[PDB]
Amino acid sequence: GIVEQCCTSICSLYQLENYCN
Amino acid sequence: FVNQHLCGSHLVEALYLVCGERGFFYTPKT
């Protein structure tokens, strides 16, 4: 999920945007 | 070296910025 993708690893803009409503 | 990870309050702030008026759901582990 977002933590493993963006906090543990490094995430890209579209990965982050995909968690929005 | 400079940190690229987004964690905790920094992750919430990131979502606030990128999602804008769409908003988002979030739950911390702690």
UniProtKB/Swiss-Prot annotation, chain A:
Domain of life of the source: Eukaryota
Disulphide bond pairs: 6-11
Protein name, UniProt field: Insulin A chain
Organism the protein comes from: Homo sapiens (Human)
Shown segment, full-protein numbering: 90 to 110 of 110
